[PDB]
Design a protein around this nucleic acid. Structure first.
Ligand code: MG
Ligand code: MG
Ligand code: MG
Ligand code: MG
Ligand code: MG
Ligand code: MG
Ligand code: MG
Ligand code: MG
Ligand code: MG
Ligand code: MG
Ligand code: MG
Ligand code: MG
Ligand code: MG
Ligand code: MG
Ligand code: MG
Ligand code: MG
Ligand code: MG
Ligand code: MG
Ligand code: MG
Ligand code: MG
Ligand code: MG
Ligand code: MG
Ligand code: MG
Ligand code: MG
Ligand code: MG
Ligand code: MG
Ligand code: MG
Ligand code: MG
Ligand code: MG
Ligand code: MG
Ligand code: MG
Ligand code: MG
Ligand code: MG
Ligand code: MG
Ligand code: MG
Lengths: 194, 99, 148, 203, 51
RNA sequence: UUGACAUUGUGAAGAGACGUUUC
RNA sequence: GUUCUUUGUAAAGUGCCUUCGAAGAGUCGAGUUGUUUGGGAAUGCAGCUCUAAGUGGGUGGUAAAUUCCAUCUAAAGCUAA
RNA sequence: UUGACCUCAAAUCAGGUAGGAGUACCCGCUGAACUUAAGCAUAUCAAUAAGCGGAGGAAAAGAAACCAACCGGGAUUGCCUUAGUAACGGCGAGUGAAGCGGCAAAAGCUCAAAUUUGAAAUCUGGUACCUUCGGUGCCCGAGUUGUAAUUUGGAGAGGG
């Protein structure tokens, strides 16, 4: 039924919903599991650090490309440009990704930079048994953070070349719209011949 | 490809010093190669023409290249697929005529 | 909590609060939005005009935040510059050591012209500005740098 | 490589060489039982391609299945229900006849595990399939590191669950927008978006 | 002359033909087997041969 | 129940479609 | 952390040059029918009819002809949390 | 008359395997109506109950015939969110996801297609010995209608 001045609700409960209620009573005790099993992973991983070294990556969509984001892997271009093989890189602390390419130098250069800076900061133990112990560092990600670049300085000079920025956009947009139309009227200029 | 650095318009997008990434062989997936180019030749003259193929070339040297295409589009399920088949006929027809 | 509830007050009066003539029956008038065009029409017109019928264009597989373009007014603008750093730029009032504000970095996507700012030059970098917003900036000794 | 020729010869099913072959073979296959043991893969280039390997432990079966829609097994047509569900004669089975093929041999050879199958012939009445199986207790496979995975209990009757190739087809497993339901597994993904998650500190 | 399936071998005389290669459709897939110490051999062809 | 398509192949008389070919 | 073993003239990685670079068919796809899906000139699934190709093929949430662009590599498989 | 091959059989032949149970959770098939719409048939309930087949300690999914239209992203699963939104709907009742973003966990791969052709290099079994989840030798068989090795698209192969 309908009455009084209230908003029209849309509560989808016409379907035996109670057969499927997930009440996270285990939110607490699962945190303990997620720990206790991180703890005991960190053990048998010897002195290795739980997580792989991961790239900088720009992050997709017009909504988000302003920020920068840890990607999945390092490309093959960056790995050889770091002077080592992908196949061996996996066996250290490094994540590789055969799909995913470089079309941006400033992410490449800054990623080969990570790779270099990473090698220099870890000690790869020799293949036998005895070693120089070393303490166990848990995160690579803590150790090698990703930060967003520089884009500009705190202040510069006002430089007004006179072009209104609004109008620059306007004309820019009009350009798009009719380019196709113009692509036509021109074609009939060729077809307007004797 | 040559981005204007402006956020709208006929090639919008922030300017980035570009690279041009090593080409994937996966992009060469349907690539011919002398191997298949040979075998598919040899199967043709062994196996021969197929029914609709036999009428396809027939419409060709008769009721135009047009009418043959319409049949070929109905028969194969795609216009593009038809034109590419009708073409393949004309080359067979080419061989039979001028040997 | 139930202790404060009205139904505690009602115990011992027949029929709860619901009456003798008119009961509390099991859905008079129908469940949910029934009879909107019919017996529940007087409430639907008034309180919910517009409810019925289509209007406008359809858009399959629409992706919100293809249209991500959050707004910022000159009305603020100077909020984007860190407080303590602000005073400095406020008096320096220079066209030569003018402050730069990367609005897109702040998370915005268009500057709009509401309100007034002081005569101080600002280099404002953004995607899209209002014809009036850039007019005010330009008139305060600043400029607009289009970015992406 | 004689195979590359076969692969490309097999494509010309309307060629006389193949018409003739198809015509003579669909008769032979019909006079044998609905299900029988096959000597050796009539499509050696094809069995191979699906993972078959000519050795001790790979078995090939051939099987007739009946072709057409599924007549709703309801008594005298009577649906007893709304008119939507009054259908009988135009209803199509959600699995593929090849799945019905795989499933039928797999019960006859319940001591083997089903690896894959492929078409070989059809007619108005039957589609014909050769199904490739593998013995999980024959040492040639138990020691083969490439195929020992199928000895695991987790692959028992994999064809009756749709883990086979036709099985993952009809079950609609594939990446993409065209497979939003059916992908993580139709029912499972349903139960997901139909479950009510309440945390301890309600949000 | 007796290979089943025949599709294994049909394209051969024509594969030979295109290359010049001399061929013969000998009788006996079991005869060619004996020829290589097996049970059946389908095909058999020498290339070198002492002078 | 009627028609099409599929299962569907080989040789002819014909009236037919412009020695092939669909009736 | 010890000790038998027993492996080699054999396995692997990397630099430039050059020539090749095989990639799954009664499938993909299309019609039509039923079913399903938020998927809307048709989201998946199936039945019958048609049935490909290799600078091919698929996808790009409005059908079609035409021109471009972009993005993966189907019709075979394994795999812990 | 003798010996092979192909196909098809038989044995209480030699050794194995399947069934049946359980089924909370899992992979499919098959499939309602009560009910809601204040009537009702489309729709709803519900791609649910019931019925059938098949697994495990998880199952399934999984290294893109993906997402995207960005400066792009990068196996799968899941939680937070996208969002009661785009969209479906006698456009009525009602239904109703996806992409990005943060997180948990992280792992990558191998066949088919290739001349080993200067060596079928591969494998079951029997059998003798031993150090027995097996090693070695011998024999039969399997296999050229292709068992090994190298190669799987990220590549890679043949030569210098
Ligand atoms: Mg619980
Ligand atoms: Mg981690
Ligand atoms: Mg009172
Ligand atoms: Mg009272
Ligand atoms: Mg009363
Ligand atoms: Mg009254
Ligand atoms: Mg009223
Ligand atoms: Mg304001
Ligand atoms: Mg039937
Ligand atoms: Mg399978
Ligand atoms: Mg190598
Ligand atoms: Mg493929
Ligand atoms: Mg159904
Ligand atoms: Mg449909
Ligand atoms: Mg597909
Ligand atoms: Mg699997
Ligand atoms: Mg016995
Ligand atoms: Mg059972
Ligand atoms: Mg019923
Ligand atoms: Mg009820
Ligand atoms: Mg009712
Ligand atoms: Mg009522
Ligand atoms: Mg009633
Ligand atoms: Mg049930
Ligand atoms: Mg069951
Ligand atoms: Mg168990
Ligand atoms: Mg677990
Ligand atoms: Mg599994
Ligand atoms: Mg791949
Ligand atoms: Mg992903
Ligand atoms: Mg109404
Ligand atoms: Mg629904
Ligand atoms: Mg994410
Ligand atoms: Mg191999
Ligand atoms: Mg080389």
């Amino acid at each position: 039924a309908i009455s009084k001045n209230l908003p029209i609700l849309k509560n989808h409960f016409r379907k035996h919903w109670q057969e499927r209620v997930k009440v996270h009573f285990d939110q607490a005790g699962k945190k303990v599991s997620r720990r206790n099993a991180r703890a005991t992973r960190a053990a048998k991983i010897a002195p290795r650090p739980l997580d792989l070294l991961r790239p900088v990556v720009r992050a997709p969509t017009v909504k988000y490309n302003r920020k920068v984001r840890a990607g999945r892997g390092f490309t093959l271009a960056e790995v050889k440009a770091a002077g080592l093989t992908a196949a061996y890189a996996r066996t250290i602390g490094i994540a590789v990704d055969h799909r995913r390419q470089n079309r941006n130098q400033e992410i490449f250069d800054a990623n080969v930079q990570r790779l270099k800076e990473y090698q220099s900061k870890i000690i790869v133990f020799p293949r036998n048994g005895k070693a120089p112990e070393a303490e166990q560092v848990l995160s690579a990600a803590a150790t090698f953070p990703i930060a967003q670049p520089a884009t500009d300085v705190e202040a510069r000079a006002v430089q007004d070349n006179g072009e209104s920025a609004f109008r620059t956009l306007r004309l820019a947009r009009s350009e798009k719209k009719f380019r196709g139309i113009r692509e036509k009227r021109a074609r009939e200029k060729a077809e307007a011949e004797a | 490809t040559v981005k204007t650095g402006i956020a709208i318009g006929l090639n919008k997008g922030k300017k980035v010093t570009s690279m041009t990434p090593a080409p994937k062989i996966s992009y060469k997936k349907g690539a011919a190669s002398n191997r298949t180019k040979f075998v598919r030749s040899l199967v043709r003259e062994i196996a021969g023409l197929s029914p609709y193929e036999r009428r396809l070339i027939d419409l060709i040297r008769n009721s135009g290249e047009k009418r043959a295409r319409k049949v070929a589009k109905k028969r194969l399920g795609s216009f593009t697929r038809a034109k590419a088949k009708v073409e393949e006929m004309n080359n067979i027809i080419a061989a039979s005529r001028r040997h | 909590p139930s202790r404060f509830t009205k139904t505690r007050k009602h115990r011992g009066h027949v029929s709860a609060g619901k009456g003798r003539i008119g009961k509390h029956r099991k859905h008079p008038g129908g469940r949910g939005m029934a009879g909107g065009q019919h017996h529940h029409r007087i409430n639907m017109d008034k309180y919910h005009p517009g409810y019925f019928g289509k209007v406008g264009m359809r858009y399959f597989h629409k992706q919100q935040a293809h249209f991500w373009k959050p707004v910022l007014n000159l009305d603020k603008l100077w909020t984007l510059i860190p407080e303590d750093k602000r005073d400095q730029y406020l008096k320096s009032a220079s066209k030569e050591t003018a402050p730069v504000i990367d609005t897109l970095a702040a998370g915005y996507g268009k500057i709009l012209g509401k309100g007034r700012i002081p005569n101080v030059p600002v280099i404002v970098k953004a995607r899209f500005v209002s014809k009036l917003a850039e007019e005010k900036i330009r008139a305060a000794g600043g400029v607009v740098e289009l970015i992406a | 490589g004689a195979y590359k020729y076969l692969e490309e010869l097999q494509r010309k099913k309307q060629s006389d060489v193949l018409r003739f072959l198809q015509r003579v073979r669909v008769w032979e296959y019909r006079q044998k039982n609905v299900i029988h043991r096959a000597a050796r893969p009539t499509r050696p280039d094809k069995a191979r391609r699906l993972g078959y390997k000519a050795k001790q432990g790979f078995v090939i079966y051939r099987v007739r299945v009946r072709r057409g829609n599924r007549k709703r097994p309801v008594p005298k047509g009577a649906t007893y229900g709304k008119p939507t569900n009054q259908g009988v004669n135009e209803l199509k089975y959600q699995r593929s006849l090849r799945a019905t093929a795989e499933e039928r041999v797999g019960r006859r050879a319940a001591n083997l595990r089903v690896l894959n199958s492929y078409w070989v012939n059809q007619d108005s009445t039957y589609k014909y399939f050769e199904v490739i199986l593998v013995d999980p207790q024959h040492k040639a496979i138990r020691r083969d590191a490439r195929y020992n995975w199928i000895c695991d209990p987790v692959h028992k009757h994999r064809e009756a669950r749709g883990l086979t190739a036709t099985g993952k087809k009809s079950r609609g497993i594939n990446k993409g927008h065209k497979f939003n339901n059916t992908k993580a597994g139709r029912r499972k993904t349903w139960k997901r978006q139909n479950t009510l998650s309440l945390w301890r500190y309600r949000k | 002359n007796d290979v089943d399936p025949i599709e294994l071998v049909v394209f051969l005389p024509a594969l030979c033909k295109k290359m010049g290669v001399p061929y013969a459709i000998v009788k006996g897939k079991a005869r060619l087997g004996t020829l290589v110490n097996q049970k059946t051999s389908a095909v058999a062809a020498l290339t070198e041969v002492r002078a």
